[PDB]
Amino acid sequence: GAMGDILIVWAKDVDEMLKQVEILRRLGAKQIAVESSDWRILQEALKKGGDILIVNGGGMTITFRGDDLEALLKAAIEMIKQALKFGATITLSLDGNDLNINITGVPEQVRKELAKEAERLAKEFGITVTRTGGGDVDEMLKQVEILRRLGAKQIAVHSDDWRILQEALK
Amino acid sequence: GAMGDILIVWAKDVDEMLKQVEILRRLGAKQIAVESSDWRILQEALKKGGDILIVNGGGMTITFRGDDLEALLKAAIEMIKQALKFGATITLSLDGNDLNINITGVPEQVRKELAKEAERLAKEFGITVTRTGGGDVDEMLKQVEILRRLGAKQIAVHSDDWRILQEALK
Ligand code: NA
Ligand code: NA
Ligand code: NI
Ligand code: NI
Question: Which chain A residue's Cα is nearest to B73?
Answer without folding.
Answer: A81
